[PDB]
Amino acid sequence: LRDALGTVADVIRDGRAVAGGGAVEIEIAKRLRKYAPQVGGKEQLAIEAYANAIEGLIMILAENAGLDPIDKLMQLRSL
């Protein structure tokens, strides 16, 4: 209850809100793979890696729901 109250208060003081289904994370992955070709130096291999690694989060979250993760990941990204 005190944790829930604090959670709500942090919403109140943000005034804004986001989804949580890992979908915030996947959308970040889609902005990143469009920013990285503008930088183009050796640094590019680092940003492409970062996007792939944060896409690596929901791949774990699905595995705790017992789904076969790779197949659900590709289906999700396709949608």
Which residues are near a second copy by CB under 8 A?
Answer: 40-42, 44-45, 70-71, 74, 78
**Residue 21 binds to ligand ADP (criterion: CB under 6 A):** yes
How far does CA 28 lie from the centroid of its chain?
6
Task: Please answer whether residues 32 and 47 qualify as being in contact, where contact means their C-beta atoms are separated by less than 8 angstroms.
Answer: yes
**Residue 40 binds to ligand ADP (criterion: CB under 6 A):** no
Q: Name the token pair of 4.
A: 């829930």
**Binding-site partner at residue 21 among a second copy, ligand ADP, none, CB < 5 to 8 Å by type:** ligand ADP
The conformation of residue 77, written as its DSSP 8-state character, comes to H
Residue 12 or 65: which CB sits closer to ligand ADP?
65
In this structure, the number of other CB atoms found within 10 A of the CB of residue 70 comes to: 11
**Binding-site partner at residue 28 among ligand ADP, a second copy, none, CB < 5 to 8 Å by type:** none
